[PDB]
Amino acid sequence: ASENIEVHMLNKGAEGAMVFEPAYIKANPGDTVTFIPVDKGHNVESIKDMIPCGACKFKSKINENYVLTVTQPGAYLVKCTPHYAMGMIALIAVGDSPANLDQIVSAKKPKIVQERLEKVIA
Numbered sequence: 001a002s003e004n005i006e007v008h009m010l011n012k013g014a015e016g017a018m019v020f021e022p023a024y025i026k027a028n029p030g031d032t033v034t035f036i037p038v039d040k041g042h043n044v045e046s047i048k049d050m051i052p053c054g055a056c057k058f059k060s061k062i063n064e065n066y067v068l069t070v071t072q073p074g075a076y077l078v079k080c081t082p083h084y085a086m087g088m089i090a091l092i093a094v095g096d097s098p099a100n101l102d103q104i105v106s107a108k109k110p111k112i113v114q115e116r117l118e119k120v121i122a
């Protein structure tokens with residue numbers, strides 16, 4: 001029962017500047033996640049080592065409609081490349097209790113990104 005989750009890349013949203021909406025993405029394995037450049041200047045990229053072991057890395061083009069197939073269970077931390085240090089990230093939680101979530105929380109990342117991450121988790 002494969003489902004698509006559409007995510008918008010925005011200069012401004014609910015949580016402030018440079019956001020993915022939603023920035024928590026709840027998915028099942030086999031679902032898809034579509035990133036939409038609603039405003040110009042965004043893309044989506046998996047953060048090095050912040051996808052589940054078994055998952056494959058990716059980096060979309062700026063202003064590209066990009067669809068990701070989330071086969072492997074676990075947590076994905078994605079960033080917009082230019083806006084990463086401004087907090088432009090999304091957490092994709094695939095299946096229950098995503099295994100590498102504590103790992104991603106511990107991993108090295110900008111304070112401002114940590115802030116947004118902990119907020120979405122909470």
Ligand SMILES: *SCCNC(=O)CN(CCN(CCN(CC(=O)O)CC(=O)NCCS*)CC(=O)O)CC(=O)O
Pocket residue numbers: 053054055056057
């Ligand atoms: S696109 C990234 C992911 N999937 C995948 O299976 C990638 N493969 C790379 C082959 N490599 C070694 C295979 N391997 C060793 C390992 O990583 O434990 C067996 C396995 O994928 N287990 C999964 C991850 S915790 C090199 C590598 O990327 O590590 C294809 C493959 O033959 O598995």
Ligand SMILES: [Y+2]
Pocket residue numbers: 054
């Ligand atoms: Y592998």
Ligand SMILES: [Zn+2]
Pocket residue numbers: 009018041042043080081082083088
């Ligand atoms: Zn951006």
